[PDB]
Design an enzyme around this catalytic site. Structure first.
Site, PDB file in Angstrom:
ATOM      1  N   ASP A  35      47.227  78.484  47.369  1.00 30.22           N
ATOM      2  CA  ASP A  35      47.409  77.039  47.380  1.00 30.22           C
ATOM      3  C   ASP A  35      48.387  76.566  48.457  1.00 30.22           C
ATOM      4  OD1 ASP A  35      47.635  74.372  46.750  1.00 30.22           O
ATOM      5  OD2 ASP A  35      48.687  74.646  44.832  1.00 30.22           O
ATOM      6  N   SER A 199      45.623  63.427  61.608  1.00 35.58           N
ATOM      7  CA  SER A 199      44.311  63.451  62.225  1.00 35.58           C
ATOM      8  C   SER A 199      44.190  62.271  63.184  1.00 35.58           C
ATOM      9  CB  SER A 199      43.223  63.393  61.159  1.00 35.58           C
ATOM     10  OG  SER A 199      41.951  63.248  61.750  1.00 35.58           O
TER      11      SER A 199
HETATM   12  C1  LIG Z   1      46.885  73.244  42.753  1.00 33.09           C
HETATM   13  C2  LIG Z   1      46.587  73.663  41.468  1.00 33.09           C
HETATM   14  C3  LIG Z   1      45.731  72.911  40.653  1.00 33.09           C
HETATM   15  C4  LIG Z   1      45.460  73.407  39.263  1.00 33.09           C
HETATM   16  N1  LIG Z   1      44.272  72.841  38.679  1.00 33.09           N
HETATM   17  C5  LIG Z   1      43.015  73.349  38.989  1.00 33.09           C
HETATM   18  C6  LIG Z   1      42.872  74.526  39.740  1.00 33.09           C
HETATM   19  C7  LIG Z   1      41.587  74.979  40.080  1.00 33.09           C
HETATM   20  C8  LIG Z   1      40.460  74.291  39.662  1.00 33.09           C
HETATM   21  C9  LIG Z   1      40.601  73.124  38.907  1.00 33.09           C
HETATM   22  C10 LIG Z   1      41.873  72.670  38.547  1.00 33.09           C
HETATM   23  O1  LIG Z   1      39.521  72.403  38.476  1.00 33.09           O
HETATM   24  C11 LIG Z   1      38.325  72.672  39.216  1.00 33.09           C
HETATM   25  C12 LIG Z   1      38.126  74.172  39.350  1.00 33.09           C
HETATM   26  O2  LIG Z   1      39.230  74.787  40.015  1.00 33.09           O
HETATM   27  C13 LIG Z   1      45.195  71.732  41.180  1.00 33.09           C
HETATM   28  C14 LIG Z   1      45.559  71.406  42.485  1.00 33.09           C
HETATM   29  N2  LIG Z   1      46.384  72.110  43.284  1.00 33.09           N
END
Ligand SMILES: c1cc(CNc2ccc3c(c2)OCCO3)ccn1
Length: 330
Positions: A35, A199
């Site tokens: 992330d 951008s």
């Molecule tokens: C970092 C972490 C998160 C945590 N939530 C999250 C993480 C992954 C996902 C999600 C939800 O929902 C769709 C499928 O993949 C959301 C945004 N940035």
């Protein structure tokens, strides 16, 4: 040193990507969500509230001879989607794609929100924004990349996300076989803790390029592309029957549509997001209403270059003293 790890979409929509990470001695492999929009490495663990674990692989620090409790440290984070997690902290050996950091803060979840429980494919997060966002108290901790940097052949990592396919995260080198043309580099602001850049504009489909500065963050942890309402309206106006739905939570379009591409600028260069990348499928199983991959950032407070945009490029996160971001086509 260098590392190279494959990253794999968690589902047929590329909702997120997971990368295997080795934690502890003997190694415990967990699939983490890399992330660049956050700065905590946290995992599901033997400490997580049992009813909040459903299918995830857990870290068990008591099984690792190199785990040590970081005494007194706790952490608590909440993400832009309203999800959250919290717990305590260990230090341990963490390796990614053959690159090893000793003494890495591994944040052990005691509590996770329902979104996390419900996604059995993500065992935790590995944050790659700047360490000033790290939530450990009372002693803030460094991210895997910051800890590795001085060891790396070059102080960079790269994100090469796949469209409906695996991709790669590399640490410490730029693979010149992985992109076409040249890499265009652009300045970064670290003031909010993010890989924040500006951008130079956009185009919709075969439309002319609009020169306009769009400040936003490169966020591998966000699925979609979130941009100002003017830009997003201009995009969806080119799709018959598209509309913004308050019930659904953003722009939807007829699943029978062929979507136009979307171009964003990086200095004088241009990255093209093919229309198919912007299709996130039926809003509910069986529906003929599909969810758009370009959404308005109004109310978020920031523009986000999430996976929909980043997967169209080869992206260099340059963590030199003055950080910068590079984008190439591929
Ligand atoms: C970092 C972490 C998160 C945590 N939530 C999250 C993480 C992954 C996902 C999600 C939800 O929902 C769709 C499928 O993949 C959301 C945004 N940035």
């Amino acid at each position: 040193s260098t590392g190279s790890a494959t990253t794999t979409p968690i589902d047929s929509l590329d909702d997120a990507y997971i990368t295997p990470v080795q934690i502890g001695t003997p190694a415990q492999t967990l699939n983490l969500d890399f992330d660049t929009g956050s700065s905590d490495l946290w995992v599901f663990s033997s400490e997580t509230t049992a009813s909040e674990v459903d299918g995830q692989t857990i870290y068990t620090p008591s099984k690792s001879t190199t785990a040590k409790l970081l005494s007194g440290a706790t952490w608590s984070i909440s993400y832009g989607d309203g999800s959250s997690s919290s717990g305590d902290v260990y230090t341990d050996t963490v390796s990614v794609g053959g690159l090893t950091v000793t003494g890495q803060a591994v944040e052990s979840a005691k509590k996770v929100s329902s979104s996390f429980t419900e996604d059995s494919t993500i065992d935790g997060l590995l944050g790659l924004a700047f360490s000033t966002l790290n939530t450990v108290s009372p002693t803030q901790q460094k991210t895997f990349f910051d800890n590795a940097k001085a060891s790396l052949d070059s102080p960079v990592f790269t994100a090469d996300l796949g469209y409906h396919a695996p991709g790669t995260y590399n640490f410490g080198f730029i693979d010149t076989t992985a992109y076409t043309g040249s890499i265009t580099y652009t300045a970064v602001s670290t003031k909010q803790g993010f890989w924040e850049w500006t951008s130079t504009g956009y185009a919709v489909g075969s439309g002319t390029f609009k020169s306009t500065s769009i400040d936003g963050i490169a966020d591998t942890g966000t699925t979609l592309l979130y941009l100002p309402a003017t830009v997003v309206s201009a995009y969806w106006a080119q799709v018959s029957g598209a509309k913004s739905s308050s019930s659904v939570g953003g722009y939807v379009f007829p699943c029978s549509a062929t979507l136009p591409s979307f171009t964003f600028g990086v200095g004088s260069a241009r990255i093209v997001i093919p229309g198919d990348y912007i299709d996130f499928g039926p809003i509910s199983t069986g529906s003929s209403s599909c969810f758009g991959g370009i959404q308005s950032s109004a109310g978020i407070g920031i523009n986000i270059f999430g996976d929909v945009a980043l997967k169209a490029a080869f992206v260099v996160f340059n963590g030199a003293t003055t950080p910068t971001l590079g984008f190439a086509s591929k």
